[PDB]
């Protein structure tokens, strides 16, 4: 129906991701549907996605730094595996998550 309240989406985009470890190999985001305000994000067109940098930490010394979307109904898997190398993964975390919105990028050269 209707509403009188009309909201603009104030939400962090991690607000809305949750990581799951059966997610490809080490693990992934996935949509929080519990979250209104995050859905009407991508819903309206506001974004397309949550945009997060995650670092996976191995025993190498070396880290994955990996980007994607996280979008209603799409999963995000996070770059990496248990073991890499045989070395195995330490620690994860990277930048913060941000509203990925698109661009119509007209060339002009």
């Not at 974004?47 to 999963?75: C, F, L, W």
């Given at each position: 129906g209707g509403g009188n309240s009309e909201r603009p989406?104030?939400?962090?985009?991690?607000?809305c991701v949750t990581f799951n470890s059966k997610l490809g190999e080490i693990g992934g985001y996935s949509w929080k549907y519990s979250n209104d305000a995050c859905n009407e994000t991508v819903a309206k067109g506001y974004a397309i996605g949550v945009a997060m940098h995650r670092t996976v930490n191995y025993e190498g010394g070396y880290s994955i730094q990996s980007s994607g979307i996280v979008k209603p109904g799409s999963d995000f898997i996070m770059k990496?595996?248990?073991?890499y190398k045989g070395h195995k993964k330490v620690s994860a975390g990277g930048d913060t998550p941000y509203w990925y919105k698109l661009e119509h990028h007209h060339h002009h050269h």
């Amino acid at each position: 129906g209707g509403g009188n309240s009309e909201r603009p989406p104030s939400v962090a985009a991690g607000e809305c991701v949750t990581f799951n470890s059966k997610l490809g190999e080490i693990g992934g985001y996935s949509w929080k549907y519990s979250n209104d305000a995050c859905n009407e994000t991508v819903a309206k067109g506001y974004a397309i996605g949550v945009a997060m940098h995650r670092t996976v930490n191995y025993e190498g010394g070396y880290s994955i730094q990996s980007s994607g979307i996280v979008k209603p109904g799409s999963d995000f898997i996070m770059k990496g595996g248990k073991t890499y190398k045989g070395h195995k993964k330490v620690s994860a975390g990277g930048d913060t998550p941000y509203w990925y919105k698109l661009e119509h990028h007209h060339h002009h050269h």
